[PDB]
Design a protein around this ligand. Structure first.
Ligand code: NA
Length: 120
């Protein structure tokens, strides 16, 4: 299947994504965490095909994690998934070559469609 790491600040939503993403699509979750520094280490350890990153997290924000994955040219699709409607955050994701930016206005079903489009 497609491997994923999920880094998300909120435990309730994070555990929900780990469970529902596996049921809504053809994915294996290698690791999940609420800390961006933790995520960056897991990412280098496991090399997942795709990562899902919240923005505002302790350690490293999702945007700093995205920036580092790109600096290092890792073969990894990156989806940011956030509540933030602020214009600044979307522009920072785009300039850093994010593969998709998904608002939490979308369902996990839509997020899965997005991962599939991105990974094809
Ligand atoms: Na599945």
């Amino acid at each position: 299947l497609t491997s994923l790491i999920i880094a998300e600040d909120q435990n309730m939503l994070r555990q929900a994504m780990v469970q529902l993403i596996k049921l809504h699509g053809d994915f294996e979750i290698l690791a999940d965490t609420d800390n961006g520094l933790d995520a960056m280490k897991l990412i280098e350890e496991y090399n997942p095909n795709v990562v899902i990153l919240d923005i505002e997290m302790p350690g490293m924000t999702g945007l700093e994690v995205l920036a580092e994955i790109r600096k290092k040219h890792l073969n990894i699709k990156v989806i940011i998934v956030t509540t933030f409607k602020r214009p600044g955050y979307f522009e920072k994701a785009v300039v850093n070559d994010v593969d998709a930016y998904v608002l939490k206005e979308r369902s996990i079903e839509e997020l899965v469609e997005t991962i599939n489009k991105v990974n094809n």
